[PDB]
Scaffold this active site. Structure first.
Site, short mmCIF file in Angstrom:
data_model
loop_
_atom_site.label_atom_id
_atom_site.label_comp_id
_atom_site.label_asym_id
_atom_site.label_seq_id
_atom_site.Cartn_x
_atom_site.Cartn_y
_atom_site.Cartn_z
N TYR A 1 0.85 -1.22 0.00
CA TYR A 1 0.00 0.00 0.00
C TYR A 1 0.88 1.26 0.00
CZ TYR A 1 -3.66 -3.33 1.41
OH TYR A 1 -4.48 -4.41 1.49
N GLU B 1 -11.27 -11.19 7.61
CA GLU B 1 -10.52 -11.82 6.48
C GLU B 1 -11.51 -12.35 5.43
OE1 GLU B 1 -8.62 -14.80 8.87
OE2 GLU B 1 -6.71 -13.72 8.91
FE LIG Z 1 -5.05 -11.33 6.26
#
Ligand SMILES: [Fe+3]
Ligand SMILES: [Fe+3]
Lengths: 320, 320
Positions: free
Chosen positions: A127, A187
């Site tokens: 990122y 997740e």
């Molecule tokens: Fe993860």
């Protein structure tokens, strides 16, 4: 309270067969010649070696141009919101996985989580590279700090923290299952409005560099979901006393809530102003993900109305 | 008590310049667009990407033969003792680095430690591969468990734990500096009787496969020593209240003790029965390492009698 294991237990079990995910009696030597949880060691190898990747070996020559000119004002707002949130998520993950790893008594599972924690660090690096490459220094800071401006982002963040903070303050067995389930949900769901969006831009040849980075991140998140699915299901068998009806209920609640919120975030980001994403089409995606992940950890579908992935094209597009 | 940071602090400092190694006021978002500790981010990149390695991509066809026949009874005893201890050390490290990482308030430093924790996991994988490749299943278990037989190994292990256990039980600022210094010492010294030995066998063409694995492990340990040297020296400047004369004394004590014990371990393993290592030649090595590492963290040499590396050949041999 889950007493955090001493660094070395000479009174620890020699037999790998006596290992438990939690509340085991290990030496805390990583005796990896005998593996009880084959899935944990396989997943370590897959996350640590097989799927290894370097974010800076992905070229970012195109996206800086497409951002400056080709992208609409709505497409730039989304890009900003999604990346700001995924930066928040992966930051929470690198930090919380140290909590899980230190409470787990099975060395192969501890190893898998160390590998997961490392992959979360690589995402933080990815990122930083995306923003260093695609946008200018002030805009990059603004995106890292976009929770400071946007209340729907700030509240998204405080909410994910709260559930992890419960376990850190009160490190009891109940707040461990909650934190573990929250990790699986984060997740399972919270990446996929973001992934769907980026893969949408990529379908029409927009930000294909950022989208390359995302495909690698998304490959990692599948292994992470796979790791915690196994951990939850193994915790069911080994610690059924912890899956009280009060907990079994709470799991179904939070999962329905989470599917609801991810959908809305997906809508607040896009707002039908993105050529490919409808506010309705978001629902059938997150609803299909919810059912997929909650049934995979031994529950009844929470949206039986849905029984089809609307964006089946993704499963072939995301591939490397 | 060092209060372990909440998962998300909306009242956290935006300015990367306000970061501290400990007792900072971060958001706990990994705002990596601004880096205060350049050495932490560089070391992350070096440990995580540049120095990445796969233990199973090293071929282990030769050593299983050389072990079975070519190796003396003394050379097999050493191999066993060294590998058993390094398995213990790296096991303690993967677990303790989760403790350090969760107490540190600088995201770039937390990132470097996650990378370190991952490298420690790869070492655990490397030793499992060495034993799976070189020796038989019963011998492999025996080596993992050789503390259960050998009191000089068991006490080596309980000792390294004790110092880490002080901080886990009493997570105060004093016991943090102690644990941090102990980590630096463990990384500085406790690998190098083992490394010197393996590089000795390798000098005469013995166990060159195991020695390949060791060169990669030893490259990692230099970065780890480099990481904690920076952390200790930055802690000196940022928290001078913690380097009381009582602590400054205790540091010089433990470092002298540690140099003493590593030397003896080096002697108990070899015993002048290894073609290249003398009980005296061990001293001038560990004494030179002690001076090198304790002066590098701003102290006076603890063995001024020594001012030369006896095994200078290693620095060219260990290279990849
Ligand atoms: Fe993860
Ligand atoms: Fe190390």
């Amino acid at each position: 309270e889950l007493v955090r294991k001493l660094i070395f237990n000479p009174q620890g079990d020699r037999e790998a067969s006596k290992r438990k995910i939690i509340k085991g009696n290990p030496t805390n030597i990583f005796e990896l010649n005998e593996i009880k949880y084959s899935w944990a060691f396989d997943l370590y190898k897959l996350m640590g070696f097989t799927n290894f990747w370097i974010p800076e070996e992905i070229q970012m020559l195109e996206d800086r141009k497409q951002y400056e000119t080709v992208l609409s004002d709505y497409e730039k707002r989304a890009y900003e919101l999604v990346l700001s949130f995924l930066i928040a998520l992966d930051s929470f993950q690198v930090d919380m996985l140290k909590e899980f790893g230190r409470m787990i008594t099975a060395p192969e599972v501890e190893m898998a989580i160390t590998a997961q924690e490392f992959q979360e660090s690589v995402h933080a690096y990815s990122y930083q590279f995306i923003l260093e490459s695609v946008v200018d220094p002030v805009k990059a800071d603004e995106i890292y700090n976009y929770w400071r401006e946007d209340e729907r982002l700030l509240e998204r963040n405080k909410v994910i923290a709260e559930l992890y903070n419960e376990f850190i303050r009160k490190p009891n067995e109940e707040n461990f299952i909650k934190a573990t389930i929250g990790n699986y949900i984060l997740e399972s769901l919270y990446f996929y409005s973001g992934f769907a969006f980026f893969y949408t831009l990529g379908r029409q040849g927009k930000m294909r560099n950022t989208v390359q980075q995302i495909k690698y991140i998304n490959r990692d998140e599948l292994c992470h979901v796979t790791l915690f699915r196994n951990i939850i299901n193994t915790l069911r068998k080994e610690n059924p006393e912890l899956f009280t009806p009060e907990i079994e209920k709470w799991i179904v609640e939070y999962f329905k809530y989470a599917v609801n919120e991810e959908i809305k975030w997906g809508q607040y980001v896009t707002q039908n102003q993105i050529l490919g994403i409808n506010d309705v089409l978001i629902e059938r995606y997150i609803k299909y993900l919810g059912n997929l992940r909650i049934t995979q950890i031994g529950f009844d579908p929470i949206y039986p109305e849905v029984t089809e992935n609307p964006l089946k094209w993704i499963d072939e597009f995301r591939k490397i």
